[PDB]
Symmetry: D2
Subunit: 257 residues, 4 copies
């Protein structure tokens, strides 16, 4: 297809799961992809498995110096930055009266501050190049509507949707598209962990939550990262140039926006 | 690219404007396209200009017998129906105290009933075939939020978003995706009419509303049909198979959903 | 009290939520036209509520009936201050079994009935020059679609849209247009809802009613008395700055 | 009247909307903690409002301050029945000029402030076993993003989210969690808003205020008094079935 031919992308948290499937689909479409992760060991493996057009970048989105160095590493390696995917995220679950300041601080630091300050750094580079840009934030059904036990993670994803809108309005004058994707329930490592938290607080065998949520998807199954790669390419591609400040649910019907 | 290779499409209201641009893009992507319009003269012209893979069908979405004969024509000519685009619509504007029963009956008959009952006829054919299906309703910024002067057209597109959600949840068991596109302000014959209506009721020179509205788009310009064709292909394509009951704004940031 | 000396009309207020609203308005000092297509049931409702209530035959699907009800409100009460568009009809059916009969029946009363009654009440409130309160009945069903409930969800989605458009156009005349979206409310309406779901989801009668009442975050099926606070609030001076809103009163069933 | 014998705490209630809420709650028979980082301004507001109002020094960004403020409410009034999370901070800046300082400042007060005061009040209401009312202050800014207001929009979007999550999780304790979304409201707050826009949009001081007031469908900038109705309603028995909602009180500025 080669919809992203000769673009330079960076994907946060892309050593594994959705981010890694995005990095693989972007390379197939002709992009050069910085596989950015706090796990540089795993990012190096993913990059070697994907091919020459992927390369590994150590990044902690909670740290300005680390954000700024991955953008620099992208510029130094790929000549610049065309596509940012804000994919780095942390999940946690607790009822209101058991939420910790540590839970709040760590999920806001990566899900909100990590997304905003990486977007800022990417937009400054895209503006300095003068060629436009594509920024794709990762939201979630969790950001469409609250849940009794997931206040913190829901709020971070609600903040990401709002940030997507703000930044898209502020950056479209530079021909930077900011938009977001809102997955449903996606099978993998991520949803294994989610399931363990619900197992504890809803008093359920390990694996039952993840079975039930997958069966309640109107489409009829839990998501895969491959359900999402179409939209990831589309929102990075010329065919989305008029799309601004949107969150698109790709969730088998889990949330209707 | 040929992402709709060997597919059979029908687009209501496609002799001109957005639907004609969709029929043109679908053909480029390998589709066979029923150019359905109440205006057979213009459909025939549009099909001749697009090429052999387009073919004209006389249709009034307000009439059951016409709906069912357009679906049959599609099966007779293309062997079946894979993609419906519900594009046929009617625009009107009047303050609350000036809305006529005639404005309401005619815009609900085309924009709502035409959409629902064509969707119904296409869903039955797609179920009969057993191969799944793609249905794309045309909503509007006007369906996201009301306007003092556009209560009827706004309500119809609000009903389309709702219908899109309902039909999506009901039809996805048959592997029929129902989604919608929500354009912003799009340049052409359509918006010339809109402008004439505002000119009268906001007491403005012809062309001033079109100017102002195109200049208030955060993207920075009035839409084109070409802005939309990417989304039209995508939502008809295998890369949108997990997308269900969504309305996607392609509007240069005019409305943020 | 809070509606002292105000003239209301409620469409479809012989029975259920509409009737709870008429009674609650009369307790707050309002005169209320109990507008219903069944004049027998309206008359009973009016006798039970007391002298401040009166019965008005009305078919919100007929222009002539609309204009005659508004006129009858003017004749009896001197004018119209509050309209509640409560008249509605429920139906259910999968996409492939939806009939033009259902579509035309639910649209004529839930949408056209709301719109043209609102138009008539607007015209009257504009001519009086004293402003006004209009309250459309939306539903959780207007907030999101449902596989089986396409037609009824669409009508209530259109009511939320209309409520927005009308509130924007009419606020210059000091007329507030807003809507209430109930969730799952116990009564003769949800007896009918349950019966349809019983057929289409293969359930014993009463099970849907039970399941949805228990899924309400608050912990039960709603009552009309849950809604009276808001219907008073939105027709009162304490909501003068409130324009073009739909407010969910639904135990958390839908979060807007 | 409607809040007779209830104990309220309002964060950041020495001045503006919070202070109008305090006075309106005392008029409706409430005892009110005027909680504010500025104890001198709180003392003045308390003295002006009358004996039912008392001042509490409170930094909603500090856990110890939050807990001591809840404890001062229990000591002074005997319990806590109504929290209003009103304390908030405005800032404006384009994406490329957002500081970590702004992000950290606005989230600490607008989000963490709201969340951990809500948690502290929840714990106290649960231990009491008598239910309660929590009202978060959202904003039109919470409803949609703006080019120059990413941080403040994001905080109020998180307040809407938190309001939904908290309301769902606390309704079993008969605690209602709801929010109010003002639009553009006149006062010291919008003075500061206008000053920031004057810089970034290159406008004379006061112009932004003028433009936004005039673009409210209703026809003017809002007052605190536009909001007291709803603040009372959401703390009252006639909102007991109202759960996890954000209600716009904004003259039509934003339609939800
Ligand atoms: O990725 C987050 C996950 O999808 C989850 O938060 C769901 O919203 C919810 O927690 C239960 O189904
Ligand atoms: O095609 C619909 C059209 O975009 C128009 O209705 C705008 O919503 C509005 O009328 C004001 O610009
Ligand atoms: O008054 C409408 C009613 O509450 C219903 O349509 C529900 O939305 C749903 O159909 C089943 O729970
Ligand atoms: O207090 C929030 C305020 O109303 C402001 O943020 C407006 O939303 C907007 O920023 C300018 O009109």
């Amino acid at each position: 297809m080669k919809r992203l031919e000769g673009k330079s992308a960076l994907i946060t948290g892309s050593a594994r799961g959705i981010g890694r499937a995005f990095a693989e689909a972007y390379v197939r479409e002709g992009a050069t992809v910085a596989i950015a992760d706090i796990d540089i060991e795993r990012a190096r493996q993913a990059a070697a498995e994907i091919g020459p057009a992927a390369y590994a970048v150590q990044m902690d989105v909670t740290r300005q110096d680390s954000i700024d160095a991955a953008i620099a590493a992208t510029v130094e390696h790929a000549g610049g930055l065309d596509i940012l995917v804000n994919n780095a995220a942390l999940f946690d679950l607790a009822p209101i009266v058991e939420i910790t300041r540590e839970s709040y601080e760590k999920l806001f630091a990566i899900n909100v501050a990590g997304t905003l300050f990486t977007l800022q750094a990417a937009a400054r580079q895209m503006i300095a190049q003068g060629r436009g840009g594509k920024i794709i934030n990762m939201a979630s059904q969790a950001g469409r509507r609250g849940e009794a036990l997931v206040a913190i993670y829901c709020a971070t994803k609600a903040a990401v949707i709002s940030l997507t809108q703000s930044a898209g309005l502020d950056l479209i004058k530079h021909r930077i598209n900011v938009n977001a994707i809102a997955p449903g329930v996606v099978d993998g490592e991520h949803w294994d962990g989610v399931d363990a938290l619900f197992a504890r607080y809803e008093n359920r065998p390990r694996g039952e939550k993840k079975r039930l949520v997958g069966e309640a998807v109107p489409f009829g199954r839990m998501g895969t990262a491959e359900d999402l790669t179409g939209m990831a390419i589309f929102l990075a591609s010329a065919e989305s140039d008029y799309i601004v400040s949107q969150t698109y649910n790709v969730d088998g019907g889990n949330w209707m926006s």
